[PDB]
Amino acid sequence: QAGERIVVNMGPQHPSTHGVLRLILEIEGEIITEARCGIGYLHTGIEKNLEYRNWTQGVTFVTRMDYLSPFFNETAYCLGVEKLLGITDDIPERASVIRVMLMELNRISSHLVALATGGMELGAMSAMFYGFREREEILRVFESITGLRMNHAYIRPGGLAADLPDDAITQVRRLVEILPKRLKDLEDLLNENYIWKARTVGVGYLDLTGCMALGITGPILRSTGLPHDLRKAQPYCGYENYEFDVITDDRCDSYGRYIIRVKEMHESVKIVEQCLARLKPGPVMISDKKLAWPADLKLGPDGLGNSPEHIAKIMGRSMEGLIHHFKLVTEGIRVPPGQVYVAVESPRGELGVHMVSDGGTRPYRVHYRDPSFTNLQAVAATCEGGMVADAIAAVASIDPVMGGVDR
Amino acid sequence: HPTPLPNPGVYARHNSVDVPARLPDGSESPLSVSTILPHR
Amino acid sequence: APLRILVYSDNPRTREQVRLALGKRIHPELPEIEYVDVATAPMAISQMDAGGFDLAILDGEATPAGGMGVAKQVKDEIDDCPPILVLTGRADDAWLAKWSRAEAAVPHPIDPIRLSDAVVSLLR
Amino acid sequence: LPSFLVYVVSMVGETNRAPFDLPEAEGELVGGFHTEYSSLKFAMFMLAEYVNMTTVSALATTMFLGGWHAPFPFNLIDGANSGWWPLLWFTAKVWTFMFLYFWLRATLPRLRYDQFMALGWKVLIPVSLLWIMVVAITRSLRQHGEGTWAAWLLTAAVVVVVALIWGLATSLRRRTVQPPPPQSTGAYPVP
Amino acid sequence: KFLDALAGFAVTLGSMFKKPITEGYPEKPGPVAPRYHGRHQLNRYPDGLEKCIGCELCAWACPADAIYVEGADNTADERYSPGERYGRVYQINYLRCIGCGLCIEACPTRALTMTTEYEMADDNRADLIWGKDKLLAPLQEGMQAPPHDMAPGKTDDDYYLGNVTP
Amino acid sequence: GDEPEIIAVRRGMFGNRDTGDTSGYGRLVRPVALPGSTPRPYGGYFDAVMDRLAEVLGEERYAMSIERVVVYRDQLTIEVSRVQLPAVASVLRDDPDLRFELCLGVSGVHYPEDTGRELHAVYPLMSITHNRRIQLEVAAPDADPHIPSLYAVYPTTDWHERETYDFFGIIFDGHPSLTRIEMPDDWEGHPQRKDYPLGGIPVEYHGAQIPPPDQRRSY
Amino acid sequence: GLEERLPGGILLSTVETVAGYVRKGSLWPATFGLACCAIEMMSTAGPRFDIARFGMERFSATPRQADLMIVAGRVSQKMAPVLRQIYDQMVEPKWVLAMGVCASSGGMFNNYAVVQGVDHVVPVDIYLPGCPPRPEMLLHAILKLHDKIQQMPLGVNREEAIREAEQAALAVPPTIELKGLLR
């Protein structure tokens, strides 16, 4: 009875809990008996704060929600906006290809962070540094393309905030060349490592029925063997034209999820190769000037700014151009009223976005069904009955990014 | 079953695990506080 | 004896506003009020450590260290700590004011009569 | 060699160093035992751990690596084992063990302490005990002139051990697989 | 061979003979991307006139309300930019700025740009509210003081078309 | 009724929320209507879904349960009637022809200007076997924000239903414990409601401050 | 501590200099990431940079050992009590680095849910812009904190410095009153 069970907080401030996740564990000595989950220590009001900003501005908010998967959040938001506008069929091919390339490089980055944080949680200290060497390789490309390392606002309703810098394609080709090797270097630390496998094989087991019941998606679901990926079922942003394998496992446990992530990195590298293969020059923004983001950023001796050609156009020549720049920048497009639920295959699962427009220039509602929030329903299933050290491995395997959980 | 049992409540001045959570009507949820704890 | 009130804020105007709401003698049925003004958390803490204060008013919006944090600190660190009143810069900050354990909380902008009544309630 | 391996593993354990840094296990218990300690008291815990590292590595050198005798490349050099040079060789060997420690930290996760204890009692203890028996018999035979009989035994014994340990590793356990059944929650169809 | 499980060792040993990759900041800072969203900068035309016309479009677009702009009239006795308006007050609260870059895309004169300079931190909440005089780009060679008449014969249109010189 | 739901009624041109900055432009009256019920031949599998649903439910039960069917941007919304939600959800999950195993969550959305239908809970459901997806929508009044919880049918909803309550006050009756999940238990109000103020503070500047976005003008 | 009770002569000065040197060179952070900025903090510890270079490799997991708090994220309302508890549970001397716009002033999320600056709950030593601040900016802020630590008084000098800082602070007009060319 009581007297032999302690109640402890894995607490917000704990190396394995990402600082803002609270696992309340009832432990019989050191076996997890019950695992209550406390959330909202990172709640930020984004879903409400959005409502007081225009479209194409809420992007800056949504990329902050699931900060490891910024491009996925932004793509979900902008796809929702386009679906509401009915512009999904008019987006340029190049914007879609860049979107796939960036989402997949982001998948590599997010899985690298997941593996790094898990490995350091399970004592694999060098996992952090090797995963972050690989991640920095990708973050340099992100910095070049967008000018930011995280929380990019690069993907915008109807296209992108700008086109790739001339050197970007070569940077991504270099990524496609080296990521296999650096990822192999990381894998040498963990993949077959006896202590790593012992630490995650059979740990955090969750049945396919459990995944369905809790609504789990992403690597956790696919570790049950089910090849469910929103990129193949319910394609979006042109994944229909990319050849890639839905990664799945049969272990149904932490190690299965880890291997799924490691292989999803390779599948992302393959999709990135395909993206570079089918990346033809063209516009990155819808040609309908009534909605297109009017700014044309270009570098100069005085830093990144509007391209002087655009300044000349809107300040010396084009009155309609000036009005469109002014209104699309300040008020922003106004979306037709209506609702739409659009989902993407975030690295952590089915990242859904419920978007409601009241005909205005500000969103009426933007609710993120972040996969991490639902995955954290699995802490009870994957921790209860196991060892606390095994509960750490399970929680790491879920790869919860608390920004998306609390939004 | 209660997917992951409900967390103990968080209040100003009280966030410990022994704190029971508040149901919409204002009552204290028995499930939020573990079975072994002596209420609060 | 005169009552000493520690008014903490790095905004001089908030300190002047607090000193205006509370005259030299609030509620003439009460003793005279002495004001020691502090604009830094370390000084506020040291003055509290000196003790002998009947009330401390901590601007919840103090820039380098908020009055709510100082309130929680002073209640955790000074035995027989005097009652704390907090000025909150936001209505939603009330919850934190509850967490700061200050006996009362007065939202900005300082309402003179509300602040005087709160103080009289604390100093009575 | 078997005794050396068992001792080194039990050593890395004794000092609480990775992959057996279990009492701390910053990834699980925040700071483990030295949570709630700060300043020179925590510093003393860590200094004690590092001095234990030094002591056990010095013992390893003393009783498996000739202690302070110069390594082979300087074994033939005159006076390499005299004067103060033995101090240099001892420190060199101790620091090779220190390097082994650091290398272990940088390339292994940490076991769960139950897994480590199962290692100790299912691998280390049986192996050390059977090695003690084998070595005793080997020395007795060599002292009784049996000669080859010992070599046939020694080499065979480890050959057997290297098998049965792998038996407890892959060939008989810890390399199996299973399935499971679904519940009433309308689960999907696994392709 | 059981060797694969030990591959990690081969990794770590190997890396301790390849050179470290750390950027040598601050003695040898790393190369930030040319497109990086560094500190906003207020620029000038070659004759020195401030590009900013105080339209507040940059501040309009800022999701964080991190820009405060007050416009004021250019006049012959005191002219800061070509045209009728200029940004008399221009503050950026860098403890609210999220570096998004929407301001830049908003600006219609390219007065606002983003440099690659990024070093910024202060002990005061108020020291990170950077004013116009902290942001204005350095008065390059050939430029004159901001308070002066337009280049002779030139007019605001001549400025926006890029048809100006020292 | 087949008339659409008006969540807001814009007055005047240019999206002015009040009198307006230019005279003579405020006389327009533009109701903000969400899409009305789709006529009948719902695109793609939608008919195949709904027909099947109409088969598994009776004509009377189907008519009493499904208030509206709205296809918009190739997305099917079933505006289900309150009270009947658990039955419809059970039919969807269990029926082999529907078999929507995966409920992806619950999202509250507040329409203060929609009389008697202020709070809408949206349930995205997906059928992996059939590779389909739809969205149930249950409308509840503000004065009676009670909705039947789907916990027995979709355990995944437990946290979502909690967050939605915390953020909107939608009381999912029958939920094991509707405790606030995101906000503190002692928190007052439901932030995602429009009636709840944004609760921001002015941004400071040398000699000035910018009030939060909810105070300043908008269109 | 006795080290601060030394006479205000050369002994106390040299002790202050050495203690400031040591505390700036061994400024162990607490393992207390919150959000985006936590990821950038890990990236700073990552090999492309090396926070360990500055004697800061040991992200202390226990608050007791941690001498520095990189808030590095957005402090929600529900987190302010926990963040304050962690701060109070570090042992002095301790400094706090408000990494990012969220930590320093609330950043873009000017909302009910966010505290609008950890300054509300804990004293802030240094404010760091960025969203997230890139690792080079974090290292810059940490070096500025090193400079602040080295020039740190002790004992009677500490009291004199507190008095001087208090007197100076009482005079600065508030930011809202620094109306410049603002009409």
Ligand SMILES: CC(C)=CCC/C(C)=C/CC/C(C)=C/CC/C(C)=C/CC/C(C)=C\CC/C(C)=C/CC/C(C)=C/CC/C(C)=C\CC/C(C)=C/CC1=C(C)C(=O)c2ccccc2C1=O
């Ligand atoms: C003329 C002439 C030649 C004169 C010589 C006189 C002289 C110099 C004397 C030598 C003999 C001495 C020193 C006598 C003086 C008296 C004496 C011994 C006083 C001791 C006082 C005392 C108890 C403490 C004060 C400091 C001190 C000098 C103590 C002994 C030395 C040491 C190193 C002790 C504690 C420090 C220690 C071992 C650990 C600190 C804690 C940690 C965690 C260390 C650093 C660290 C570790 C270890 C990680 O594991 C790690 C892993 C991953 C990333 C980062 C880290 C990390 O940062």
Ligand code: SF4
């Ligand atoms: S910086 Fe550009 S957008 Fe901002 S006020 Fe000046 S001209 Fe207008």
Ligand code: SF4
């Ligand atoms: S970078 Fe973004 S947040 Fe910062 S001032 Fe420019 S627009 Fe505003």
Ligand code: SF4
């Ligand atoms: S300041 Fe920006 S980058 Fe840092 S945690 Fe907040 S949103 Fe993320």
